[PDB]
Amino acid sequence: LVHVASVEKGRSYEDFQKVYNAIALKLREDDEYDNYIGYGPVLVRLAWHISGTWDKHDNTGGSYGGTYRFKKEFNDPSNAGLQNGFKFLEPIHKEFPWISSGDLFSLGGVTAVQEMQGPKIPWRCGRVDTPEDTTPDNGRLPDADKDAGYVRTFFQRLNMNDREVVALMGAHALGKTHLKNSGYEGGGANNVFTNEFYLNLLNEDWKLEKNDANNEQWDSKSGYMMLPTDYSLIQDPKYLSIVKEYANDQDKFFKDFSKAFEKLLENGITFPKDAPSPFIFKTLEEQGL
């Protein structure tokens, strides 16, 4: 099963920077969402959930097809809450109807990371919408109530190794859990991309508690929380080494996250030899906008 990237006809860097800018300007404008977190974190989770359906074994799922737009995937219980991200992106898609769905969902995640002061994430165009029957079934995204061994095995399906997994999980610096969405009770409200996930894991006094949905999570006196799968990164000795590394080197985390996130967003896509190079978009700040 081969998905060849096909550049939206006649489009170039400038076209995609315009889309980036529209996203980034709306992110700035819609500042009240989710107790003033804004839409940055949900857009990052959207880009992850549309990519994280991928199966390396048969190349089903993945970001290429834009299949989140179809009800089976839209309605996946694992995707509860992401409708907010999709709604945010709808007027962008109306303004730029030439962009493919996969390109828009993935670019929304790139834009959010960068606008939240995260690393530059190189991004390639050419995802092509595929039909409804290519929508992967529900149940390919990960459970949160599980241990390090589960996390490790789960991520092998996405061709991610220990360092990639640990780096990617640093996105959990962003946003919060919502009991109605996932059965986890959120802590904090952060919308600035940092290595704080690792620092929190290592430095907080964690207590294993039950939340109002009767699920276990790790909570600290300072009001932070971790999923069991988050906390598993300091229970497993191989993950722990990497957590300590990112807790002590913001730049290394940024670089590794950028690589792993691009890879996640590109899994399943064959880029022709004469495809454009990855684009690195300027932030609104860098443009003086």
Residues annotated within the binding site are: 45, 48, 172, 176, 178, 181-182
Tokens describing residue 63: 């970001």
Helix (H, G, I), strand (E, B) or coil at 216: strand
Q: If contact means CB under 5 to 8 A according to the sort of partner, which of ligand HEM, ligand 1LY, none does residue 226 touch?
A: ligand 1LY
**Distance from C-alpha of 237 to C-alpha of 243, rounded to nearest angstrom:** 10
Q: How far is residue 195's CA from residue 210's CA, in Å, rounded to a whole number?
A: 26
Tokens of 69: 């737009």
* Burial (Cβ within 10 Å: 0-12, 13-18, ≥19) of residue 134: middle
Q: Which of 182, 211, 250, 283 binds ligand HEM (CB under 6 A)?
A: 182
104 binds ligand 1LY (CB under 6 A): no
Nearest residue to ligand HEM, by Cβ distance, number only: 175
C-alpha dist (Å) from residue 213 to 10, 80, 148, 182, 185: 51, 16, 23, 9, 8
Chain centre to alpha carbon of residue 30: 19
For the window 225-254, what string marks contact with ligand HEM as x by the rule CB under 6 A? --x-x-------------------------
Determine the Cα–Cα distance for residues 15 and 122; give it in Å rounded to an integer.
15
Q: Which of residues 24-63 bind ligand 1LY (CB under 6 A)?
A: none
**Residues 127-156, interacting with ligand HEM (CB under 6 A):** 142-144, 151
Residues at the binding site for heme b are 45, 48, 172, 176, 178, 181-182
- Residue selected from 3, 11, 45, 93 as contacting ligand HEM according to rule CB under 6 A: 45
Calpha distance 244→276 (Å, rounded) = 37
Q: Which does 181 bind (CB under 5 to 8 A by kind): ligand 1LY, ligand HEM, none?
A: ligand HEM
Helix (H) or strand (E) holding 206: strand 206-210
- Of 169 and 247, nearer to ligand HEM (C-beta) is 169
Please report whether residue 48 would count as binding ligand HEM according to CB under 6 A.
yes
Q: Computed over its alpha carbons, how large is the radius of gyration of the chain?
A: 18
**Of ligand HEM, ligand 1LY, none, which one does residue 127 interact with (CB within 5 to 8 Å by kind)?**
none
Report the interface residues with ligand 1LY, using CB under 6 A. 172, 174-177, 225-227, 230
The residue ranges that bind ligand HEM (CB under 6 A) are 41-42, 44-45, 48, 81, 142-144, 151, 168-169, 171-172, 174-178, 181-182, 184, 227, 229, 261
